[PDB]
Design a protein around this motif. Structure first.
Motif, mmCIF file in Angstrom:
data_model
loop_
_atom_site.group_PDB
_atom_site.id
_atom_site.type_symbol
_atom_site.label_atom_id
_atom_site.label_comp_id
_atom_site.label_asym_id
_atom_site.label_seq_id
_atom_site.Cartn_x
_atom_site.Cartn_y
_atom_site.Cartn_z
ATOM 1 N N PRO A 49 9.225 3.646 41.019
ATOM 2 C CA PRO A 49 8.784 2.646 41.995
ATOM 3 C C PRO A 49 7.508 3.130 42.692
ATOM 4 O O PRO A 49 7.088 4.282 42.496
ATOM 5 C CB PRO A 49 9.945 2.604 43.007
ATOM 6 C CG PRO A 49 11.055 3.503 42.437
ATOM 7 C CD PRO A 49 10.354 4.450 41.517
ATOM 8 N N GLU A 104 15.617 6.998 39.793
ATOM 9 C CA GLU A 104 15.099 7.000 38.421
ATOM 10 C C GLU A 104 13.882 6.107 38.271
ATOM 11 O O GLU A 104 13.782 5.056 38.910
ATOM 12 C CB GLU A 104 16.168 6.556 37.412
ATOM 13 C CG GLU A 104 17.441 7.375 37.401
ATOM 14 C CD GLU A 104 17.295 8.762 36.771
ATOM 15 O OE1 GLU A 104 16.252 9.089 36.134
ATOM 16 O OE2 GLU A 104 18.272 9.527 36.917
ATOM 17 N N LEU A 136 14.545 1.290 36.127
ATOM 18 C CA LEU A 136 15.698 0.574 36.626
ATOM 19 C C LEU A 136 15.264 -0.639 37.428
ATOM 20 O O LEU A 136 16.102 -1.357 37.963
ATOM 21 C CB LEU A 136 16.580 1.489 37.464
ATOM 22 C CG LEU A 136 17.390 2.511 36.662
ATOM 23 C CD1 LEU A 136 18.373 3.259 37.558
ATOM 24 C CD2 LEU A 136 18.117 1.819 35.528
ATOM 25 N N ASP A 137 13.949 -0.859 37.502
ATOM 26 C CA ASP A 137 13.364 -2.032 38.165
ATOM 27 C C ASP A 137 12.330 -2.651 37.215
ATOM 28 O O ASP A 137 11.458 -1.971 36.696
ATOM 29 C CB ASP A 137 12.720 -1.634 39.509
ATOM 30 C CG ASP A 137 12.593 -2.807 40.489
ATOM 31 O OD1 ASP A 137 11.921 -3.800 40.148
ATOM 32 O OD2 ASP A 137 13.154 -2.722 41.609
HETATM 33 C C1 LIG Z 1 15.571 -0.850 44.764
HETATM 34 C C2 LIG Z 1 15.951 0.055 43.630
HETATM 35 O O1 LIG Z 1 17.280 0.041 43.076
HETATM 36 C C3 LIG Z 1 17.282 0.898 41.883
HETATM 37 N N1 LIG Z 1 18.350 0.520 41.028
HETATM 38 C C4 LIG Z 1 19.458 1.220 40.623
HETATM 39 N N2 LIG Z 1 20.107 0.421 39.680
HETATM 40 C C5 LIG Z 1 19.394 -0.736 39.520
HETATM 41 C C6 LIG Z 1 19.569 -1.864 38.733
HETATM 42 N N3 LIG Z 1 20.706 -1.973 37.831
HETATM 43 N N4 LIG Z 1 18.605 -2.971 38.800
HETATM 44 C C7 LIG Z 1 17.531 -2.906 39.631
HETATM 45 N N5 LIG Z 1 17.353 -1.748 40.426
HETATM 46 C C8 LIG Z 1 18.294 -0.669 40.368
HETATM 47 C C9 LIG Z 1 15.833 1.311 41.601
HETATM 48 O O2 LIG Z 1 15.546 2.657 41.372
HETATM 49 C C10 LIG Z 1 15.013 0.384 42.454
HETATM 50 O O3 LIG Z 1 13.675 0.675 42.604
#
Ligand SMILES: C[C@H]1O[C@@H](n2cnc3c(N)ncnc32)[C@H](O)[C@@H]1O
Ligand SMILES: Cc1ncc(COP(=O)(O)O)c(/C=N\CC[C@H](N)C(=O)O)c1O
Lengths: 578, 109
Positions: free
Chosen positions: A120, A117, A482-483
């Motif tokens: 990145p 999602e 999510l980042d």
């Molecule tokens: C390394 C990767 O982990 C994912 N990812 C999935 N869930 C989380 C979260 N709660 N926090 C940070 N990154 C997350 C991303 O899509 C990111 O780019």
């Protein structure tokens, strides 16, 4: 709404409100034939409708800047790692004729066991997610009204979560995708039972969306020593995926073979690749021909890449091609730059236009050495098929290294790629459907026991829930990011600065790269090292050589250099007259 | 080698040779298609959920749990349908529930 031909794309604005974006249309579009078309003083036999806004060929100045477009859909491939910069390279290709924009997945996406999602940064490709896909498709909606002709967004539906991305592609109006479960097995070593059981769903979802499907038999073109000997197996990889896709439910008119002329000079490549081109098109009538260009016998010379490509366009014109993808002339020199995606389009358009009507004047000598080889390749393939049945089915043939063997079949060297039936990535992830298994959604393939809850709904399973996301888009969970530190908003923030200075770039905004060409009166190695120096003195950084060519051993060497300019200029301190 | 092998096709006509090429192509893919009809996998199950209004994150958790309890054969979107109706909640709520570790002892019947 919006878009002025003299104002850059507001990529800051396109990125806003992606939570409320919806694809403007669905499925594949072809080009509109424009019969006896008149442009300038000329009449074209094999043209398609004109663009409303475009950049015509330099030499189109001697003819009123006319911009004839040929009949085949024209691909360019753009994926740098940052979808946000590439949305601009898209706009430049669109103006140059490309109406099929194809995007490569970030390194290793094949192994993502689920969607990702957000946004990145990619490695040697864009990471495909919903935000990014909604973004680029929203930008293409704009870009296609600008030019006045629709544009097919394309990506890849492989991996251990093909079915996953099939959905998301279906929802978000991705127009075309690669889908060939043989890719998973041979090149990514995904497990074959799970790979093919997955493709049934993947393909059904794809057929629902009216998407166009391109296969990956041409892959065996590259990972292969003497590419002309792979021709019986190409027919075999093209056939398996096609009869497969066909029986899943996919339309024959949406099934494209991905067919690349296997050779390039100094081989007599026409002589070698043409019987094959004819054989294939005779054996696969009613299937689409997606011609790709040569990548395996490429090198550091753009000039050389181009000439081989024109011969590639020539194979297509002598036979048939519903889509004519291209490859950048610099593919073997580096990672494609804005200017070289554009060269690819220009060249593809230029060659096809110059060969307008060619087949009203030329034809194949259908009996002769030609028909004999057309016949032989067909026999060799049928033989290959006969042996795959004898050995008792597709899995056993794979496991015995039947594929990717460097032998001109029936010849077998034993150097092929063997996968284990019981092994690979995703072994032991197949589960038997039980008697009362059910799935309440549109576009499901396998055994779905629906009667149990309602005998009437059998053909509309999703009505058990008043629509799956395919009927009810508002049921789609949209993830934004999510980042917090690795995303498009940080990247864009990093360089507010620039949006009133300016600098050169090849892929990413203000990356500072440029190309230097020179001639040095000495042998190559020395010439090369002397070449670095000159570049250093010229204030470039991160300097490296990407092409050497011998003019003659002692007399001289052509060198080419990519380097970084460590400064900016100001548009406001440029003395510019009228 | 190839001349030995090509024996029985040599006098096959182009229509026969083509129809034979596709005739066998078909027989080679059929067992593949059957495997596809009678069986399921995690990505397939996750995809059914995505269509059912679940996020990639939520879908993973349900299928990850479905596999633990040995329930794949029944269908993950089905586990979320029967639990929805049984306890009278929305498909969404009963799917959230399940994702979080709830209603699993119950689902087993
Ligand atoms: C390394 C990767 O982990 C994912 N990812 C999935 N869930 C989380 C979260 N709660 N926090 C940070 N990154 C997350 C991303 O899509 C990111 O780019
Ligand atoms: C059938 C198929 N599925 C997936 C992938 C790659 O996608 P991931 O590695 O993320 O699974 C490929 C790649 N090679 C194709 C070249 C393309 N036609 C191009 O013209 O370069 C492929 O052929």
């Amino acid at each position: 709404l919006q878009l002025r031909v003299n104002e850059k794309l507001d990529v800051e604005n396109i990125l806003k409100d992606l939570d409320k974006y919806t694809p403007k249309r669905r499925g594949w579009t072809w080009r509109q034939p424009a019969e006896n078309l008149q442009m300038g003083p000329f009449i074209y036999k094999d043209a398609s409708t004109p663009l409303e806004n475009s950049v015509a060929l330099p030499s189109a100045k001697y003819f009123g800047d006319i911009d004839p477009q040929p009949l085949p859909v024209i691909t360019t491939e753009i994926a740098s790692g940052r979808f946000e910069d590439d949305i601009r390279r898209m706009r430049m290709a669109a103006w140059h004729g490309a109406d099929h924009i194809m995007v490569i997945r970030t390194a290793g996406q094949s192994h993502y066991d689920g969607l990702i999602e957000g946004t990145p940064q990619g490695i040697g490709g864009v990471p495909i997610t919903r935000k990014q896909v909604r973004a680029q498709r929203k930008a293409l909606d704009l870009i296609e009204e600008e030019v006045g002709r629709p544009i097919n967004y394309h990506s890849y539906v492989s991996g251990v979560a093909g079915p996953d991305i099939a959905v998301m592609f279906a929802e978000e109006g991705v127009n075309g995708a690669h889908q060939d479960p043989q890719y998973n097995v041979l090149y990514r070593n995904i497990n074959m039972i799970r790979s093919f059981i997955d493709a049934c769903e993947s393909k059904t979802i794809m057929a629902w969306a009216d998407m166009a499907q391109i296969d990956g038999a041409h892959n065996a073109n590259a990972t292969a020593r003497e590419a002309w000997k792979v021709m019986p197996e190409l027919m075999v990889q093209h056939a398996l995926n096609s009869i497969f896709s066909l029986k899943v439910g996919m339309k024959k008119s949406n099934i494209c073979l991905s067919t690349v002329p296997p050779t390039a000079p100094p081989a007599p490549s026409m002589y070698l690749d043409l019987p094959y081109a004819v054989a294939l098109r005779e054996m696969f009538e009613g299937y689409r021909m997606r011609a790709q260009m040569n990548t395996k016998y490429m090198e550091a010379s753009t000039r050389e890449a181009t000439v081989t490509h024109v011969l590639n366009l020539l194979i297509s014109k002598l036979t048939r091609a519903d889509i004519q993808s291209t490859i950048t002339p610099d593919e073997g020199r580096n990672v494609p730059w804005h200017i070289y995606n554009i060269e690819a389009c220009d060249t593809a358009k230029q060659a096809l236009i110059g060969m307008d009507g060619l087949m009203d004047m030329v034809q194949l000598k259908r009996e002769g050495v030609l028909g004999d080889t057309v016949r032989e390749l067909k026999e060799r393939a049928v033989l290959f098929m006969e042996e795959i049945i004898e050995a008792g089915g597709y899995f056993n043939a794979v496991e015995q290294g039947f594929f990717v063997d460097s032998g001109y079949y029936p010849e077998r060297n034993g150097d092929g790629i063997a996968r284990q039936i019981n092994g690979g990535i995703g072994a032991g992830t197949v589960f038997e459907r039980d008697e009362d298994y059910m799935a309440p959604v549109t576009a499901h393939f396998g055994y779905n026991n629906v009667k149990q809850y309602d005998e009437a709904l059998v053909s509309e399973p999703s009505k058990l829930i008043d629509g799956c996301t395919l009927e009810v888009p508002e049921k789609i969970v949209y993830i934004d990011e999510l980042d917090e530190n690795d995303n498009v908003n940080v990247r864009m923030e990093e360089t507010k600065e620039f949006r009133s200075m300016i600098k050169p770039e090849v892929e990413w905004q203000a990356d500072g790269t440029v190309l230097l060409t020179m001639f040095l009166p000495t042998s190559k190695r020395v010439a090369e090292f002397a070449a670095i120096e000159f570049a250093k003195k010229m204030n470039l950084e991160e300097v490296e050589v990407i092409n050497r060519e011998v003019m003659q051993e002692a007399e001289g060497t052509r060198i080419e250099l990519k380097g970084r300019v460590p400064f900016s200029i100001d548009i406001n301190s440029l003395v510019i007259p009228p | 080698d190839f001349q030995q092998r090509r024996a029985h096709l040599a006098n096959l006509s182009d229509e026969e040779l083509q129809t034979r090429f596709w005739e066998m192509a078909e027989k080679i893919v059929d067992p593949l298609l059957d495997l596809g009809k009678k069986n399921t996998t995690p990505s397939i199950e996750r995809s059914v959920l995505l269509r059912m209004g679940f996020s990639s994150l939520e879908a993973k958790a349900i299928v990850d749990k479905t596999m633990d309890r040995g329930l794949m054969g029944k269908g993950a979107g089905h586990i979320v349908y029967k639990i929805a109706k049984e306890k009278n909640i929305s498909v969404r709520e009963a799917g959230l529930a399940l994702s979080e570790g709830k209603y699993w002892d119950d689902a087993i019947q």
